[model samples]
Target chain A: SVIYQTSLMSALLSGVYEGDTTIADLLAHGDFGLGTFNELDGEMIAFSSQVYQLRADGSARAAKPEQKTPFAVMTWFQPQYRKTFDAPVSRQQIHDVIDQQIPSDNLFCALRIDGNFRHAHTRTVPRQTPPYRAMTDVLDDQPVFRFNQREGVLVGFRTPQHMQGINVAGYHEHFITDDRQGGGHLLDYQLESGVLTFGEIHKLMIDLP
Target chain B: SVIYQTSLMSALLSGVYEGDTTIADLLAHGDFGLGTFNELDGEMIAFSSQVYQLRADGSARAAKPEQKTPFAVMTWFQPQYRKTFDAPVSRQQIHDVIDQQIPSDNLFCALRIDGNFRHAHTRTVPRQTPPYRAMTDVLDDQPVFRFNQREGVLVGFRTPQHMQGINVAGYHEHFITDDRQGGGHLLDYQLESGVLTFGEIHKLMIDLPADSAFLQANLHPSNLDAAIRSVEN
Candidate 1:
């Protein structure tokens, strides 16, 4: 695991909104991760070794290598295990089921849930101008989307509680439809049916921008 | 923000095997989070205001309030936004789509995705006995699961890259089906459809353990990066 630039606390708390780290540069470090573009344009999701921009207008597009992010995290994903299941479950139940599988709570893990859903809920934050507001402030106008009986996938990780300031302690996942029509930060879902796969990450590389 | 006893770096690096912090006590601090029980028995997933344990046998059960954890993280999850989508997509594509919605990468955000998945892949770690072994050594025997077309929710957060050592940067999510049958650390999925919601956390708190094991264990390791990567993914 290679970390880029500064800690999330330093940037989010102090509101450091500018950086010269480009998508191309970040990709050079890892193939999977997430972050935000300069001026707080929108969310940055790096998947399948490609970077994308989910804008305020509820639109997603491939990001140019030259595009820069003030904050981001990436890694070369190499899964150690894979699994498949057939069941009808709710969002809360999904967490419960996963709770039984993790061997330890002290380490970190990356997740990818791909399949068909009975329903999926998601949200997108709008672009922010200079004099950037706090995260909560910008989310006041965030847009929400709900998909019914659609096909898609979820991406994210599981961090330990002791790493609170460094990252969110629990599960953090994002969503995108297979059609490439819509997606955003995951809010909730009811698995009508699907498959889940994950792997343990043993290394981290950090780079300060 | 206030934190409870012990840091992740202290617990893992030093191999501190015991602690007195109880699940009930930790719950008082936050409703949504993750951690491990004392002696490193198994993984803990705190969601929907409840705590659960994933034991060595690859079994999950509700955690007793008295259960103790050597390491964990959590926060009051108050989602600020919610939405529903009607299209189909894959796991990797979801990351691409969400990238355009986040206003900034500098802050921490909690997220929840609910609905249905055509297929989901997950894995769980086994319990360990003392002279506790390294995290990767224990994972060699981990169990894996795959859900075909299931209904459930995915919970976790989006952390900045800079928090690498302190946290697993990027999106970290866990899964459980609606039927309460199966789920675990999400590895992959193809969504048939669902909903998404999230909120921002502005406060942080930490607590250091006074236990002898925590105090006596080594806090630094030469292979910090490698150890973290093996343990995290």
Candidate 2:
């Protein structure tokens, strides 16, 4: 049976289909170019310069993007402060941990799709700016969430430019990419936050100034 | 020295410039096209039709050809022979003593190249019929000679074809591709018996059956000028 799935390179390839950019353009300054089939190590290799029209404006929906066994990776931190420190630690603690550890210092995150329906998601919270070289303390220390939802939750979240706060409202669950099993534990948890649900319909569409 | 190497796809692309074949012609009935870059897994998974070109000739080079590495699987084996006893042998002689074993039939060999340089070149035996196979009989093997005036007796070897009663001149050597550190050991063994040799010459000519040289002899130099630029460009 022939099965297909998405990948980081495919994502980049999709960008070409959308007319946003091109593979040649991306590889212009890099060490990428036409190579031999044998040079590629037994992989099916071909070279083409073409364009494609996709279903969405910028979303990449590949043909047969469904691999039977999807894999994913997740990394979350345990919340440090869970209501009262003396209270018994619970799942909610983990949610607080992620929020506390990830600072609002212009962090960057990535989501990579794989053939096995697996995806890799990562985030990096960079150090403070020039004048403020002081290291920010991580707030949360415990985990709160339990599972990742299918379809609707934000597989990834991005902070808007010039925006101060981030809204968790339509953002629910996120799976990891490195985990071959397709599911990784939460990176952070919110105490009062509801269960991290995943559905295909979740969206955060509020207009930014 | 910083040595730059081309890729299999690039080499094929150069074939297009050399007027050998086009990309579309090569992948006519195949899936996917050539790629400029590959992932860590070394797979060229992304491609489109618009990116390929159909060769002027009707015949298309397969996107993936059999006996071609990355697509071909190679293995090795020896012949098996049946044995019979000339006289009644004692049970102790059969158990405690020894017996002579004679090779009967040759074994099968195969290997696959996965887009890596180390496994590209292969020893291909030619055949008169389709689905040509390689001979695995050691005795059937022949010696191929390579004579060089500058370097005496460079190398020698031979190989057997898949077909019966057929042997070809062959040699095993490590061939390097355009990609640095990317090449494999291949036996450029011949499938048919003929004179195959290499020497320094200003030009190469292909003789026709009826004529001494029907084609132009010395049209011009820099014939590969465009091809060379296309490959690098």
Candidate 3:
């Protein structure tokens, strides 16, 4: 099961760019999720029971409990299934592989992949001032980062198509390093070796603003 | 742009099984959308400036202005792009064709296909009484229909993957024949000849419920995904 702060469409499409829920509030519901900071300051990743903020300058730091989120999806991590792959795999190949393992297309899945990455590509959205604009406009100026021989974990969810407009349908993921030095919204990655664990979520509770 | 009344999760999972908005209210927001009636009475299809209800027992009729819906997604139909195909194509092929035509994967699209259908298979959910059950429970006795060589219009939407939990991703469509006698939620179809039209929507608005039933319902139902899958397919 997952508890969401608000709908993605409300923030991304309606231009409601201000945070209404605090990071502390979000943590109370679930320890894992992805969202953006207040005023769209940077990308927010909640993993390993802690929240991290990734900025456009390619810097990552521990976010304070006071930080707020306009939109976020989180769930208590409890994996019911696990898998390990020692061989390197491309980003598309990883998707195909996961596609084969998923039991059903209709359920939501929380995924955590940990290990070494031969290569990883990520992007962070910059802070914006009002009047706020659409996500597509903000994404145009996103800063991209490239990492080599990086060790980190990818945390995200696989949502069903029928849930579109409420949460990310496919895979909405964020990445963070083992040393807590780097990570952002994962764009692409080539795995060197990794272990993947997942939990099926049949229940979803949405908190509307 | 589009204006939605409620989230699919609330109605499907929470069992807030009553409609708070009317067809007239929905029509004011968009001319094309799909949903079900209050009490899960039947399938609702709004297209070409009109709304039709395809009830169980394979019957089609005009929906009244006062009828209500628990979940729906609609948009004012305005096609910025158009194309025509004279050859036959399967439902999956049509999806593939549209996949190639879309300019980007991030935007939402409204689609309309008008032509002769060589074959079309549809299904309708039966009406249910209070102490409402999960959609899967209601769908157990769903009525199905198959049409051959029928002329009609297919109206629906193509949503991005990132919008899951809010709207149906990929293609969520409904069908109605030119003669206005046959049509329901599209399960499968083969087009003999047709013209397709589409428009992209960059904006969306949602009106949340303030009713106690909506506010108090426990939305964390573990069977929702399975329920949705059964009802949809």
Candidate 4:
């Protein structure tokens, strides 16, 4: 599989909040992935080919085709591996189990876990204006919300350590309830019962602004 | 332009001498670039759709289509800016001049220079068999060659510091004579006269190896930055 990325996480961390590629442009390259909107206004999740905007106010809706993103990573996800978890699993437990089986640490992948959540904690920041602040500083007082018994899917990308500043080295994911009601950047989650599917990516195409 | 790369410098540095991409496959992506042949056989320069191998014995020729490379970077050459040097100029002088004009520190580019060199020093290593050792040790006693008053073109790439392990973080180039008689991994050069061109690249498509050889090999070398600096020159 091929991973398509826009801009860089290093750029976004340094407060590069505006973008040149539209949501429509991103969909052209991928139908699955996650990212943030222009000006860091809201979180974005590309699921099943539909782009959704998870707002700071905890509202979820379809993002307009014209909306832009400063940073995003997407792929035409075709799961290569699948595992079922009949018992509840924490975020770290899921990661630990997969780490033991993956053939190589030098790999890129798209991870999706769908299940009923016993408890899900997520956070999002309000839209910032011009003269943007660094993401590290802006996320200091992020509004975090906790939802119990909400069925949702975790959507995100897994980048290798070599990518460090170019992209988040580890998993950076977001949550979106099945009903399209609410979700945000995932902090921690307890999957009551779920299935985790992984799509291994072999190549990466980075579009720098 | 987009910079197309195969594998990673870290992989090659770790003695992953075998390759999955052939010379024919590399030429399909770009017309200009530089890398080394499989088994670290010699230095390679991809110029004008032609691939040349510069050996340890200081010989050069067109590489066979079946030749393979472990790591290489290529891009279509279209000069965005040009600089003319009418008098003798050293390697550091060329780098210093370009550093002052480039707009961004976070940029990728294909660099090419065609000129008459007053004196050029280069080196290439012998081909290794299976059970390859670290490149640093393999190049400890490299065959360095000197050529005076040779007309040649320098084919290379300029990478940002952020690309570190994935690619040579800075300028890594090779010298190939105009007549295709001699050249190797560039060491020092006195370009008596030349024209330098820069082709800025906005995108990078990295085609990683999917085979077990690369998949099972160690991609990270302890203290990679220093290790690269030791071998790059």
Candidate 5:
């Protein structure tokens, strides 16, 4: 379908982490997506018309409609390929399988994985204040967390390599446990059992800030 | 104003040079912009709700609404900055002046320069047949053109560095003569007198091609970065 994004990855890299678009307005663009709160507070995960903030304090919260995001990428997902993994599967295996199913590497691909996980590794950046340092500098001290045997949903976008400066070049996913308790920027994960669904995105609209 | 583009420069580099978006359909997206015709026919120039095709043989004609384009970038232009140059101005001088007015290297800038040119240098590629080669190889011996003391308008865009894969990264423009005689992809020009008006574009929409050719091609060329730079300049 379509992928709607606000701001650029380059803008965030340059410390432009404050924006004017409110969360309430962002939902109008898509039903599923990922982004960060203004001031780079925490990682964001949106699905089923609900937005969640996975904070650096290793906690999660239902984000208010009034909160704003400096950068986000979303789409009204329409799954075209589906797979069921009854046995153990690793993150790399999921991505490799996707490459085989979706042959075109030029277009954006949005994927979702719902599963019982044996292990999940994540990292989140703490909220920043004024006189912001570049994101590269701020991420140097990012907090990393590992979840054991948690059931969660992983929402991510596989962007094109040519879109490097505008968005994350490759697979970038955010995770949220089913209990709505903890999740963050996904680093790696091993699944006990899972179902995968993904779709290709043809139209890309960028609303610049 | 917004800049609406169809397809990506990367797709064109891969020789996917035919598209279904007609001139009539594309007009609904923007009234001011530039592009090339299907089969990489020639340069396209749009202004004042009119479209012109500057073909390879140094000829100009009104483009038909039923005709299609492989690649096009347009915007509903709103001028926020204006300039008047009564004396001669070189192409480099015009670009330098733009840098002063539009400080941000991050947003897209659409510019128009209406003027009397002392000299204009341009280049255009001929239409390709089947068994197509890469655009870089096709343009190896592109036709070079020159015009003298002509009255014309320059339609152009100064794109962001990050948008290299999607569009031309720097100043890319096309020219059309006032007499509706000739013009092509602008390489350089010296204006004796000109009026410049430009605006910023805050949004960009790209409807990726659905054609089977585009869907199956190898879009990730190893030397894509170098190839784009060479083809654009």
Candidate 6:
């Protein structure tokens, strides 16, 4: 499924550390801005940890934009591929991330941007499944990671594992758990551009494993 | 309106002159591999185009890759913006690019891609005049382009006057034409990767006289509409 929250988070993350400005502000404003052209309504505001600091003159300065270590955490669930529901693909994909994150970090974050169906389902279906059956289940099952503030947004799914284990931060057991179902290999991750905004963030996940 | 044909042509032109292999093959296939991944199907055939020439035990060079010079011959039209059919405060816009060309000298031409309703039609109405309305009237006004490569397999539309102009064969008429009743500016001419296979292309007419916003640009029905809506109303 498409994870809009991830796109918002990516934009937010980029805004804070890389100074992209657009996605960052979009993240701060809860609304995904999928509807209105300029105005963004606040939908979900989970954490306000002073990602940046505003000076006495009201000019905001991101804390340690250059020095602070940057990383990305991506979460996805199995069993979502073969299922269909009223929710958008982003809702399902984000739900997978949320499901994984809830057990892992207990954080409930929503997107500042919306994801489209292209982010989740494959254009072509796989063989074991019915022809044109949305083979997204197998191919779009997992996430990857990359940790570059300048690259704008990474391409495919980038699990926190991919980011956590890299130059941004060393692996911590709290962030890493064994692939419970051994579906790890099935999680095909690569980096590309010009997809959904949130999907672009997912591609930023590194290839640590 | 951002015509699919224009985008496909732009991509074809860029690939022929500046883009990479993936784009080159997509143009070669004629009918884009819209349903395939990254245009892999066309890419496969394109890769073989070079391989077929280098076979070890094969006869002398049977074919040579030609250096093709491609251009577009298009008509740009005035644009209209309006609220969406379903949503009122929500608007939609469109301009028309009549015919266009690609690097293959192949014509991927048609109508305009839709535009941004937010800029022009901030309110919805039952029957709104087209200057700020979201509908097409030139070719049955289905609100979508039909790229007909095969018999009756409609693909996409053309570019609009409001987007940008293509320097085709030294006949530098703006790709997006606004000389007619519904006209505006030309936004852009680009070829995205995936649309070719499905017989659909994406086009845009942008950066007119309006405050720049990615949301506004993308939300607009097509790139052509965005440019037309930005016209001083």
Per-residue lDDT over A100-206 for candidate 2, one digit per residue giving the tens place of the 0 to 100 score: 44432122221111122212232222212222221133232222323332221123332212111222221223332222122222244222222321111111111
Error of 4 at B156 (Å): 1.5
**Alpha carbon lDDT of each predicted model:** 0.67, 0.20, 0.74, 0.85, 0.87, 0.21
Q: Show model 6 residue runs off by greater than 4 Å.
A: A1-56, A59-209, B1-19, B23-151, B158-233
Best by lDDT: 5
Model 4 lDDT tens row, A1-209: 78999988888889999888898988988889988999898888887898999888777779898999998888888888898999988988888767766657678878898889989998876688879988878844567789898888889777887678888887788898989878888898888998999866889898887
- Span of 10 residues, lowest total lDDT, candidate 6 chain A: A173-182
Chain A only: TM-score per candidate:
0.87, 0.21, 0.92, 0.95, 0.97, 0.17
Give TM-scores of the second chain, every candidate: 0.85, 0.17, 0.91, 0.95, 0.96, 0.18
Query: Once model 3 is optimally superposed onto the true structure by TM-score, how far is the C-alpha of residue A153 displaced, in angstroms?
Result: 34
Estimate, for each residue in B27-115, the C-alpha lDDT of model 4 and write its tens digit: 88989988988988899998899889999877889999889999888888887879999999998888777777775756787788999
- Model 6 DockQ vs. reference: 0.02
The runs of at least 3 residues in candidate 2 whose Cα sits more than 4 Å from the true structure, single-residue gaps closed, are: A1-209, B1-24, B27-233
Identify the runs in model 4 with alpha carbons over 4 angstroms from their true place. none
* lDDT tens readout by residue for model 5, B1-233: 67889888888888888998899988898889898999989889998779999888888899999999888998888879999999999988888888888878878889999989999988776888877788888844678788899999999999887777788788998898889778888888899998999887888899888788777776668877789888767
Return the TM-score for candidate 3, rounded to 2 decimals.
0.56
- For residues A51-114, write the lDDT of model 1, one tens digit per residue: 7787768778989999887777676766555656577778777766565665455545777777
Q: For every model shown, what is its TM-score relative to the native structure?
A: 0.51, 0.18, 0.56, 0.94, 0.95, 0.18
Q: Write the per-residue lDDT of candidate 1 for residues B1-233, one digit (tens) a residue.
A: 32222355445544665677789988887777776788777667777887777665667788899988877777777777776767877766665555556656655667778888988877665656778766656634777788877888777766555555555567666777775546777778888889877775543334555555554454445555567666656
What TM-score does the A-chain of candidate 6 achieve? Answer: 0.17
Candidate 1 residue runs with Cα over 4 Å from true position: A1-209, B1-6
lDDT (10s digit) by residue, model 2, range B21-57 = 2233323422222222111011111122222111212
